[PDB]
């Protein structure tokens, strides 16, 4: 008892701009063999390709529901059992980190947020939480906070009584040693499924007001969306089980090459896989906050997003090489 960090790769399909220009892919996926092959240069007539094996692989045709049913539901269940799980998204801007985590809405109001097929991890997860706990006989309370880092300043994106210019501050919990205390960050209680949306949307709004202030805010900022569940399960025979589960959904700043947290994460990951005594957790806010998610007592997953365009070959390969090194990181949950 321990468990490796599981890494999945998700290629995005071509957009219309790429299709109208008869875009040809330099990427291939074999979910069955769990491999991703990349045409590192040359022709489809004859070429050289680089292959990588990950814990899971999802090609361009993969829909949100697929990702949720495969990687998220199983991790949500662990969370409901009373554990800590963290999921990430890593990749160059434009590859789908935000689609994956939050997703979007189908045009012309064709749908309600609960059935929108374009929904990503965050909302589908908040919807199931109520769907699975209200079902059985469990007393629970759910909580959410959306913390984001920009050039090492922390921003609270869900306090509708504050503005965002205000940075919050970080301190170490004298209680837990692999933890920090973020003074003032608000924790919004989601009383029921029909409250989930406005809460998200509000964060959407505060965010667009963050984009006006900070340059490239959506590309250079790290987003940590946390949902905390307090459950008091009473079995049918009548036993009381008091659990506390926490899930962190992190949308990292684009990997494309200033960002102290991005650089540190890579250095922390290097130390962990190279079994180096000192792990530079403290050299960045992101890594101190999420210290337990990297060689800690939390179940971690990294979803690496990539592009199929030949224009992004170089960045696509850095992302794979990076994600592939992560696989060797060891975590001990209980
Ligand atoms: N898996 C996908 N399926 C359909 N569209 C996608 C997918 N991944 C990315 N896209 C599209 O690509 C663009 C890149 O989106 P985004 O999620 O914002 O990327 P990033 O956060 O990595 O910068 C969006 O317009 C989005 O709709
Ligand atoms: C607000 C919001 C989302 C979020 O998860 C989110 C964004 C910013 C901060 C916190 C959460 C997500 C979404 C939500 C519900 C249904 C859906 O289909 C897509 N994507 C969009 S477009 N919206 C409207
Ligand atoms: Cl769906
Ligand atoms: K896909
Ligand atoms: Mg984004």
Swiss-Prot record:
Posttranslational modification: A subset of this protein primarily localized at the spindle pole is phosphorylated by NEK6 during mitosis; phosphorylation is required for mitotic function.
Top-rank lineage group of the source organism: Eukaryota
N6-acetyllysine: residues bearing it: 132
Cellular component terms per the entry's GO annotation: ciliary basal body; cytosol; intracellular membrane-bounded organelle; kinesin complex; membrane; microtubule; mitotic spindle; nucleus
GO molecular function: ATP binding; microtubule binding; microtubule motor activity; plus-end-directed microtubule motor activity; protein kinase binding
Location(s), subcellular: Cytoplasm; Cytoplasm, Cytoskeleton, Spindle pole
Chain positions recorded as ATP binding sites: 91-98
Domain Kinesin motor positions: 4-329
Keywords on record: Acetylation, ATP-binding, Cell cycle, Cell division, Coiled coil, Cytoplasm, Cytoskeleton, Disease variant, Isopeptide bond, Microtubule, Mitosis, Motor protein, Nucleotide-binding, Phosphoprotein, Ubl conjugation
Presence of the UniProt keyword Transcription in the record: no
Subunit text: Interacts with the thyroid hormone receptor in the presence of thyroid hormone. Component of a large chromatin remodeling complex, at least composed of MYSM1, PCAF, RBM10 and KIF11/TRIP5. Interacts (via C-terminus) with the kinase NEK6 in both interphase and mitosis. Interacts with RARRES1 and AGBL2. Interacts with TPX2.
Disease implicated: Microcephaly with or without chorioretinopathy, lymphedema, or impaired intellectual development: An autosomal dominant disorder that involves an overlapping but variable spectrum of central nervous system and ocular developmental anomalies. Microcephaly ranges from mild to severe and is often associated with mild to moderate developmental delay and a characteristic facial phenotype with upslanting palpebral fissures, broad nose with rounded tip, long philtrum with thin upper lip, prominent chin, and prominent ears.
Purpose of the protein: Motor protein required for establishing a bipolar spindle and thus contributing to chromosome congression during mitosis. Required in non-mitotic cells for transport of secretory proteins from the Golgi complex to the cell surface.
Listed name of the protein: Kinesin-like protein KIF11
Lineage of producing organism: Eukaryota, Metazoa, Chordata, Craniata, Vertebrata
Coverage span on the entire protein: 15 to 364 of 1056
């Amino acid at each position: 008892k321990g468990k490796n960090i599981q890494v999945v790769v998700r290629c995005r399909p071509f957009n219309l701009a790429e299709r109208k220009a008869s875009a040809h892919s330099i990427v291939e996926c074999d979910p069955v063999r769990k491999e991703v092959s990349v045409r590192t240069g040359g022709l489809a007539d004859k070429s050289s390709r680089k292959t990588y094996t990950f814990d899971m692989v999802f090609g361009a045709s993969t829909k949100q529901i697929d990702v949720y049913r495969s990687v998220v539901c199983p991790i949500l269940d662990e969370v409901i059992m009373g554990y800590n799980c963290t999921i990430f998204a890593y990749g160059q801007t434009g590859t789908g980190k935000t689609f994956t985590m939050e997703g979007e809405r189908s045009p012309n109001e064709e749908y309600t947020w609960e059935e929108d097929p374009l929904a990503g991890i965050i909302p589908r997860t908040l919807h199931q939480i109520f769907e699975k706990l209200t079902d059985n006989g469990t007393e629970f309370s759910v909580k959410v906070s959306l913390l984001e880092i920009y050039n090492e300043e922390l921003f609270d994106l869900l306090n509708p009584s504050s503005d965002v210019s205000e940075r919050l501050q970080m301190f170490d919990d004298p209680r837990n040693k692999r933890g920090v205390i973020i003074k003032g960050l608000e924790e919004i209680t989601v009383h029921n499924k029909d409250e989930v949306y406005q809460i998200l949307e509000k964060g959407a709004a505060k965010r667009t007001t963050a984009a006006t202030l900070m340059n490239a805010y959506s590309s250079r900022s790290h987003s940590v969306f946390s949902v905390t569940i307090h459950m008091k399960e009473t079995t049918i025979d009548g036993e009381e089980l008091v659990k506390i589960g926490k899930l962190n959904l992190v949308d990292l700043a684009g990997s494309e090459n200033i960002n102290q947290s991005l650089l540190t994460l890579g250095r922390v990951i290097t130390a962990l896989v190279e079994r180096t005594p000192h792990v530079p957790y403290r050299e960045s806010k992101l890594t101190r906050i999420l210290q337990d998610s990297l060689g800690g007592r939390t179940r971690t997953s990294i979803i690496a997003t990539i592009s199929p365009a030949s224009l992004n070959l170089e960045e696509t390969l850095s992302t794979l090489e990076y994600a592939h090194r992560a696989k060797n990181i060891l975590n001990k949950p209980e």
